[PDB]
Amino acid sequence: FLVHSSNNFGAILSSTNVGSNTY
Amino acid sequence: FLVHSSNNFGAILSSTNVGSNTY
Amino acid sequence: FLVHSSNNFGAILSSTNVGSNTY
Amino acid sequence: FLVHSSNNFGAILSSTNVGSNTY
Amino acid sequence: FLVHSSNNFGAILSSTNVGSNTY
Amino acid sequence: FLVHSSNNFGAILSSTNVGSNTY
Amino acid sequence: FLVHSSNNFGAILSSTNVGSNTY
Amino acid sequence: FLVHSSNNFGAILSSTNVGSNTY
Amino acid sequence: FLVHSSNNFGAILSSTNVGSNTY
Amino acid sequence: FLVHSSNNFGAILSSTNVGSNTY
Amino acid sequence: FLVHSSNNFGAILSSTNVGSNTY
Amino acid sequence: FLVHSSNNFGAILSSTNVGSNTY
């Protein structure tokens, strides 16, 4: 018997930069 | 019997920079 | 019988820089 | 019988820089 | 029977720099 | 029977620098 | 007069997971 | 007068997963 | 007159997990 | 007149976990 | 006239965990 | 006239845990 509940009521602003690597 | 509840009511601002490595 | 409850009501500002390493 | 409750009502500002290592 | 309760009502400002090592 | 309660009502400012070692 | 030279002769294996956040 | 030279002679294996967030 | 030279001849293995935060 | 030279000839293994915070 | 030279010939193993904070 | 030379020929093992704070 497993129960997983996730409730979100809030504003979420996200910025993600992955890279910009010089080889 | 397992119960996992996560409730979020707050604003979340996130910035993530992964990289910028010179090799 | 396991119960895990996480409630968040507060603003969260986060900044994460992982990298900028010169090799 | 295990109970883990975490309630957060406060503003959280975080800054994390991991790196900037010269090899 | 184990109970772990953590309640936070206060502002938390954190700064973390891990690195800046010259090899 | 184990009970662990931690309540925080105070502002917490933290600064952590781990590194800056020349090898 | 600015000169930026980056030469890489070594194998580079990288894994990056950004996310897996429950709101 | 600006000169930017990047030469790469090495194998580069990369894996990037951005996401898997439950809202 | 500025000169920045970075030469890498060594194997580099990196793993980065940013996230896994429950709100 | 500025000269910055970084030469790396050694294997570098790194693991970085930033997060896993419960709010 | 400024000269900064960093030469690394040794294996470097690093582990960094930043977080795991309960609020 | 400034000269900064850092040469490393030795194995370096490091472990860093920053956090695990209950608020």
Numbering used by the authors:
A (entry chain B), B (entry chain D), C (entry chain F), D (entry chain H), E (entry chain J), F (entry chain L), ...: 15 to 37
Give sentences copied directly from the paper behind this entry.
Islet amyloid polypeptide (IAPP, or amylin) is a 37-residue peptide hormone that is cosecreted with insulin and one of the most amyloid-prone sequences known. Overproduction and aggregation of IAPP leads to amyloid deposition in the islets of Langerhans, a pathological hallmark of type-2 diabetes. Although the precise link between IAPP aggregation and disease remains uncertain, IAPP aggregates have been shown to be toxic in cell-based assays, and genetic and animal studies implicate islet amyloid in the progressive loss of pancreatic β-cell function. Over 40 different proteins, with diverse native structures or in many cases intrinsic disorder, form amyloid associated with human disease, yet all amyloid fibrils share a common cross-β architecture consisting of a continuous intermolecular β-sheet supported by networks of zipper and ladder-like interactions. Amyloid fibrils have a similar cross-β architecture, but fibrils formed by a single protein sequence can have diverse structures, varying with time, self-assembly conditions, and sequence modifications.
Cryo-EM was performed on fibrils assembled from 30 μM IAPP in the same buffer used for kinetic assays (160 mM ammonium acetate, pH 7.4, 1% v/v DMSO), in the absence (4 replicates) or presence (2 replicates each) of 50 μM YX-I-1, canagliflozin, or doxazosin. Fibrils were imaged after 2 weeks, at which point fibril formation was at a steady state, as judged by analyzing aliquots with ThT. Fibrils with a similar morphology were observed for the control (no small molecule) and doxazosin-containing samples, with the majority having a twisted ribbon morphology and crossover distances of 60–100 nm. Following helical reconstruction, multiple distinct IAPP fibril polymorphs were resolved, revealing further detail on the apparent morphological differences between the samples. The majority of fibrils formed in the control (69%) and doxazosin-treated (72%) samples were classified into three related fibril structures (named LL, LLU, and LLUU, respectively), which have a shared structural core consisting of a pair of protofilaments related by a 21-screw symmetry. Each protofilament is formed from a single stack of L-shaped IAPP subunits, with straight β-strand segments encompassing 13ANFLVHSSNNF23 and 25AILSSTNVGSNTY37-NH2, hinging on a turn at Gly24. In addition, further flanking subunits presenting U-shaped IAPP subunit conformations and ambiguous β-strands were observed adhering to these two β-sheets, with the combinations of these flanking subunits differing to generate the three individual polymorphs LL, LLU, and LLUU. Thus, out of the fibril structures that were identified in each data set, YX-I-1 fibrils consisted of 89% C-fold subunits, whereas this subunit fold was absent from fibrils grown in the control or with doxazosin. By contrast, the control and doxazosin-treated samples consisted of L-fold (62% or 72%, respectively), U-fold (34% or 28%), and S-fold (4% or 0%) subunits.
